[PDB]
Specification:
31% of the residues lie in helices and 6% in strands. With 129 residues, it is mainly alpha-helical. The protein has one domain: Lysozyme (Orthogonal Bundle), CATH 1.10.530.10. It is found in: Secreted.
């Protein structure tokens, strides 16, 4: 599924991401825009044997089980298949766990490369939330 921008923001807000751990809603929408272009089925395979899954491109080394990644910790306690669902439930629940670790939203490559320090409230422009 390819989400619309405000459609996604609304779902993320329902699940309490607005301001979670110090990250306003626009950070999360921006992250999804540049990680996956809002595509729930996006997949990126990396050189270290891990794969990034879904709308938030969550990595399989620490966060989900795909049965084939070295150093697997599966700290969200979910199959990586859950992160490719058309609803965002598993991705947002796991994201809360990721962002509560160590480096916050710096875990997301695209957020660090395209969102950090920008006018992130632009990503919820014209949404009625």
């Amino acid at each position: 599924k390819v989400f619309g921008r405000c459609e996604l923001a609304a779902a993320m807000k329902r699940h309490g991401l607005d301001n979670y751990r110090g990250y306003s809603l626009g950070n999360w929408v921006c992250a999804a825009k540049f990680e996956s272009n809002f595509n729930t089925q996006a997949t990126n395979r990396n050189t270290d044997g891990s794969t990034d899954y879904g709308i938030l491109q969550i990595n399989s080394r620490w966060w989900c089980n795909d049965g084939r990644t070295p150093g697997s910790r599966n700290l969200c306690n979910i199959p990586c298949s859950a992160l490719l669902s058309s609803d965002i439930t598993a991705s947002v629940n796991c994201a809360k766990k990721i962002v509560s670790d160590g480096n916050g939203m710096n875990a997301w490559v695209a957020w660090r490369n395209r969102c950090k320090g920008t006018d992130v409230q632009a990503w919820i422009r014209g949404c009625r939330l």
